[model samples]
Target chain A: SNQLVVAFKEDNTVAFKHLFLKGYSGTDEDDYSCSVYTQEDAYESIFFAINQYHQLKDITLGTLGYGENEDNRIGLKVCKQHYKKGDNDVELDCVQLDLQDLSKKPPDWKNSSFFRLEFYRLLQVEISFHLKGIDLQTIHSRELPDCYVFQNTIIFDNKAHSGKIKIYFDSDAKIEECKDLNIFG
Target chain B: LVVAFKEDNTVAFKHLFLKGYSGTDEDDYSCSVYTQEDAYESIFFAINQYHQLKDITLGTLGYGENEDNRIGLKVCKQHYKKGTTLNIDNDVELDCVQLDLQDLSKKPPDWKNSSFFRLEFYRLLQVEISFHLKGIDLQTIHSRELPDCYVFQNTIIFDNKAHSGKIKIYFDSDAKIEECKDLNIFGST
Candidate 1:
């Protein structure tokens, strides 16, 4: 069955980064996962991670994450992530995600449908996704000299299942995909 | 002397110079005598001599001598005497002898005693002797007062373009004699 296209009113969202983590013991329930990294590390890590995971391709990742614990309210970790250091047994620092890889994607991803998921409550989160799509061979390519492209998507979910999703693509993707799928009158 | 005969009745001379008289010999007739000067003085001298000689009814003298060996007289020239004082008032007269030359020559013997040569006397007498004597009433001649007399202090020529003639009148008693000497007489001449 076709998913019911529900229209929601525009909601205000906020995004930020974390400088330090405090007030919560390091536990599974207290741990917050974040993709918060610099744009270059975040893009590279996101690209490699997406290519490595065959289920994710032709999509850019954002440089933000969110989490919370009993001692701390929900807060955002914009560009930093926590990990355990070796032999120290203390949480020092870990490898930061590469952001440059997030800017590269196959052009066909513009027409591909995608979804986002969010977890952790204390952290505010945001992501930017870029997509470029190619023109099909059968279409009248004269009216469109260049392939269609777009470069923005945002997700603001801070709970495990409660967050926001925003999708954007080139106009030609919608026209082509909708015609092929015959999903619109 | 110079003599001029007018029809044998009158003989006029400048002076009478006689030679034979006063006991001079017939051949040495140098006892000559003549009137001292002209004017009333000479008239007086001749009359005085005739009076002394007791001559009667004389014709005239000061003309030298006559054909009958009588003395004859003529009018003599008069000169202003330098120092003579004239009384203009008492000397004025209106005598007929001033008018008629014959009468002036043969006038009454008493006329010799009168002052004839004074200017005031002649001006006063000319009022009666002139033909217009009747027109010159006594009021015109006598009523007028005499002008101030001046003694000829100076003489000045009065040049007037309107009058071509000139006149010279003697100054009367009002003249200042002391001032007269300082004036230039020759400068005016």
Candidate 2:
């Protein structure tokens, strides 16, 4: 007997940009793509326009629902090693999401005035790399190694709710072939 | 401790008339104009009013004294076989008088505080008696044949502090004697 109304802040456009870039990378000017595995084929992806002038602010990923009986849920898949951003590993990666009203109120969460948001991460992602001295065709033929993944969930009430942002890159990829590579050196 | 009173020192009572008898078969000759009376059924009655007065005084004052100076009363029944020698403690000096047992068949008088009385049987005879007393020892003996009737009168007083005693009556013969009893009277606290 729980009901909650959850709405993501409009400012999550920055989070969408970061997540889309981290999820897919290619040289195609028209279309970018990433392979995601889910129990059902119910997968939808969103893209944010890029800008060369300004830095991104906060990011959040949330769902819409009002109560335990609502039909709102979300999940994510990522390579474990790709979830961390800097050498410090400062941000949390979210893989799954479930929104519910802990309070038994219709149309909105009531007690303590909070909506519960849960996030989870995928356990497996394949990373492929081309090494020197290996033939290009042979390198492209070899299967990528699976990386461990982790998920973290958190609650977000409308008063203060935010999603984490993360950046990913293929460490073994040649520096010359990488696109949008923001190297400090 | 013993306290003795001389006859002159103690209050005494003369006998009170209990029953009067008429002299039979004797007639007086009539004189001229005089009527002759055959016999006189006359009984003289007198008592030392001082004894009756002293008893009331002792009854009032005797309770808290070191020894009781007053006399008391009680009654008992006797049941023994023939030739039985009864030994009863003379807890108080006694004077016994016999009364009809039928007159007091129910509810024999209580004698818890009185002196003892004994019933001895030399033959199988039924008797009843009443008693009065002045004092008694711890124990005494009664060894005699059952007479037709007997009565006694006297005063019993406590001679020492903590006046307490018991009377035990035994018999010699196994033959049962119907009813012979004693009575006593005294005051309780």
Candidate 3:
């Protein structure tokens, strides 16, 4: 996408310095959204993949909008990610944040700036999160999300599993107040 | 339950707090972990012990919220016998009576009958647990999806004081431990 583009080597490794995100995919008036960064600004992005975000300099925050065309569609489509222990399979469960949110809106990691992913089970895998030590106008800004997890038995019954998907948060009009401060602060 | 606020200054860490197989009695597993000044990885479990017991409670970790005294933590362990007993043999760890917060989850593979939680003894025998976290992985365990919520609600007294609330737990599996053993995996495991 125009916001972020990652170049990979034939060996499946990230082509250093080639990782970046910026600009708009469409032209002027038609371009309903935009992505802004602090000059190739990059961070660990993965709490489980890298040690810290200290490496992420000049943090980039961007804005995206929804429109009639796909170019203005503010979302990453058919995305994929992974976190393996090594040449081996040290299966464990974890949750993480997606850099996309920051790429979409910096300082934008507000309430909606991440993805909770589970890796281990390409099968009966269900992704859930534990919110601890929470301080937030946003429910939580966390360690692992937008990643994968492991399980006891990796099954395959993708009958499009469904469960209670209700309103986790109230609508702005329904919400009385923002009792908690912004989590990123 | 590991939540790294993704906020600055708030560095999140998860460590093994209590680890051990259930004995005929709860006291049997009343784990007493101590941290020393020069302490680092001095505490560990005999990995192969799983044959002797089941591994319970993976990473019952800790985090900081600007000197809140009570270390907010997330931890969970399987229940043996309801109303059985809950004991944490931290005798001298009550200087300020500072407590930590944490969340726990279902047991993982029985690598060994071993169970180990990391802690740091900053002060004299005052231990703090620190283990492998790619900086952080919030809700590292699958707890929310965890069912079988049992409440062991009861309260009596604490230093002539007391705190009573729903003691949440799942009487299903044991806790497992995870660590980046060596340069074996990522840059810093």
Candidate 4:
């Protein structure tokens, strides 16, 4: 299977500059999904290794239903759960903003602009990413999401599938109303 | 119990039960210590003068939280007469009241490179107890005061007049006074 797969090596450290948010979708209130595209040939050269997960996580962004096969356009998938398991119902910070005017649509990369999802590491193994703080031009122009944290339980495999698989929040996160003020100045 | 520190503000070792005191009468229940001397004499005098006669041990020692004046030092001694099987009823535990050293909260100018030097106790003297630190400014300690408790030279003196609460001593996070290699204490004769 020629499905795109990326993994973490022993020396491969995830940083803020490694990824860009291509698109995000929240089909249901319990789960939210997003895909982070890599820079240049990062997926081919720098993405392949195993820390704990056998199949390193990857994402398939939904396209306009033309049934055109999306092989090379895949990116790293990040899935977050709103409730604890399916029963206990412990609510977590999971929010998605409608990038389009009064509508929720997958942000087009080439024709339109999107916010860069910069990553930062917390105390130990947790990976925290913020939509603000990065001094990019798009940060001031677009509405960004609140900071979210998840464990380093990402996967990568030759078999890329499209569906919802709930992931966990490794640490506490704050979900605030989207603010329009410039995060830098 | 006595604690030793390293050059890097780490605890070198802790010598426990080298000496202890137990009084036959309630009026003579006090114990004395001389911490100004070297590790040898500091423990030697306590044993030689019969102050270290009690079959007891010092419990866990810790410091209070921020602005909370407390030095957690507990004394666990035998309350039995003799030849009684060790049981819960045969033991007595008590905690020492730590003094409020809030005014001396700021780290002294010469606190860097300073290590805990000695601890002294005098039941009869005006200064009942004191904690010493090496390399710290004795003058800085002298300038600070809290009622009967103040610093004489390099030692923080707790006089007999002011009641005790919990005492506060600062050390590096990695400082393990429990580690024997890092701490060295004198033994009884």
Candidate 5:
């Protein structure tokens, strides 16, 4: 009742080492895609685990938009943009994780808060956090706005709407033995 | 000449150098101290007093390069503490110093006539171990089979590796110069 869990099996778990979080904001084929968010000094990258262990708790998806190929799914994308400046415009490569589907409704996202993701990379192993569990959390917050935000899980506040969504894990997480959840890439 | 000492300040044994360890590549000192009847006659041993020395002496620093008068010093050992029933890795501090006599001001005007250089260890009553050898060349120093002669007062801290069982001398506080009259004591290159 206090948390939401996304799992493909009865015992789906991963003891992810070197977990980190990053935030970014952009839209489909726009001039301000990579120009405005992660590269700037507004938000700092956070390390959840370094030479340590952290369990993959949840993968929460926001509201999915129709007729939009880029912002409609829960996935990862590499965006390349020709950014403009007063003196020297430059070409840049930006990696973005789509969490716009976790919102209450479809968002324009131009004036919304940036989305975040938990990234895990260990030696010779890459754990891909993809959305392959179920159909969609179509309207997560419209059901209950204050239910999901207060638990000890990472949540996003899009300013226009705020709610809790999680792929929750128990607090007593360990690295020794867990079910093989196919999270490895 | 190689001298081995006991913990009670006794001379365990002394081996003279007709030709030293590098008379050829095939003949070198493994410097092992194993007990048969509880005695190792071949290797050197020392007490905690002398091994506590942070610095010792090597050869002269910065004279010639890749020439005939090249010298090398190698010290290798097994146990950190002498006569331990079992071997263990422990921290040991040792250093090397070079004798610089090339400057005319630091030498006697009639120096070439001198045949022997006397080195006195001020802190030591008697040496726990000593090695006098010859025939070390630039090839030995460059290949790191031995260290360069020009490195003066360099200290190395190692465990179970570069201790007195094996050591390369670098520094000792000794004053006064002696003429090179006795080349036999100094080893001929």
Candidate 6:
């Protein structure tokens, strides 16, 4: 619900984890896509997205898309969020995930309304192949490759989409388990 | 809180440089993997503050292996808040002092049960886990061997696997970083 933090091994490999919606109430739960309306403002938007994601009690993500042209998958190039600009885009991006390089004094700011969860740095761990309509689950199952990256029980088509595939650390890469690596390349 | 460091005889912590994996969503410190002996040790020592990952440092952050003093590219696990002062070691203080790290104590979704998280100056915890390291560099690469690449902040690849024909990072024993740092390769090049 409250999205934040993309944990990983001390070696730099990210972790593979998910929020288990206890008693979901939505029909689109299984097809949960990374779709967030606007708070419009930077700090505000994420705050809202997080709050809403949990409040709705939706199903876990990963489902098929309505069409091939429907680009709503993740883990990039399908459907991605466009962060607004700022005088310091880099810093802005950093702050968004609380990941700016330099550290300073303790923050004494007011929390955004309805924004309660503590972390959101994981938001920095963007999504891919998530077209505007395709969900990762569908994308995960879309491929029929013999050898590919495996996470959870799904086999991600390593051949179809390759590079540094940052997987969820807990993913079941049966063939090979790369330590400190969720995003495999 | 004051702390002390000691080399525990039984400590299995290895890879001085690991990526992610906090503790256990179901259990606690230590992992099930074999090589994780060292990594487990480092995390065990670092995130000792219970659910809160206090100060876990990464190497200096800058260009090249030796940036300022060539201080082994890493950042120290220091306190980062907006209204406080921090005195950490090996921190790459940037031009923008209060970059998102205005210094805060924010926890992750499932702060306590995450295994692949760091005390990143970001305290940057994880749970309610939501992330996928999606990039063009990896179409797929099986085996224990990860495509040759350099990741920064355990997130973005400071270096892209440029020059690899076809938009894929598969089974390349000798892949190199040929693209720019953090290139938005959104399914392109």
DockQ list for all candidates: 0.00, 0.00, 0.01, 0.00, 0.00, 0.04
Q: Which ten residues in a row have the lowest lDDT in candidate 1 chain B?
A: B128-137
Expressed as tens digits, the lDDT of each residue in B25-66 for candidate 3 is 233222222223112222222111111111211111122222
TM-score of chain A of 2: 0.16
Candidate 6, superposed: residue stretches over 4 Å from native: A1-156, A160-185, B1-189
**Which lDDT values do the candidates have, in the order given?**
0.23, 0.21, 0.21, 0.22, 0.22, 0.22
lDDT of candidate 1 at residue B65, scale 0 to 100: 22
Model 4 agreement with the true structure over A1-185: per-residue lDDT tens digits: 12112221111222211222111132211322222111221122112211111122131121001110123221222222221322333232322222232122332422232222111100011113223112222246566433221222332110111101122222122223333332222
For candidate 3, write residues A95-114 as lDDT tens digits. 33334543553334333323
TM-score of each: 0.16, 0.13, 0.19, 0.16, 0.17, 0.16
Steric collisions counted per model: 40, 52, 53, 19, 28, 106
Instruction: Tell me the tens digit of each residue's lDDT in model 5 across B63-111.
Output: 1211234332223222232223344334432332222223223435242
DockQ: which is higher, 3 or 6?
6
Top DockQ prediction, candidate number: 6
Residue B95, model 1: lDDT of 30
Off by over 4 Å in 4: A1-89, A95-185, B1-189
Write the number of the candidate with greater TM-score, choosing between 3 and 4: 3
RMSD for each of the candidates = 79.9, 53.8, 23.3, 25.1, 25.3, 25.9
Candidate closest to the true structure, highest lDDT: 1
Candidate 5 is graded, for docking, as incorrect
Off by over 4 Å in 1: A1-121, A137-143, A154-156, A159-185, B1-189
Residue A78, model 6, lDDT: 12
Question: Interface RMSD of every candidate?
Answer: 94.1, 58.2, 17.0, 28.3, 34.6, 17.3
Question: Between 4 and 6, whose DockQ is larger?
Answer: 6
* lDDT, candidate 1, B1-189, per-residue tens: 001111111110011111112222223222222222322343354334323311211111111122233332222222223233453343322232322224335547545555553432122211111110000011111234421111211111111112222211111111121111222111011
**What is the TM-score (0 to 1) of candidate 6?**
0.16
Least lDDT summed over 10 consecutive residues: which range in candidate 3 chain B?
Answer: B152-161
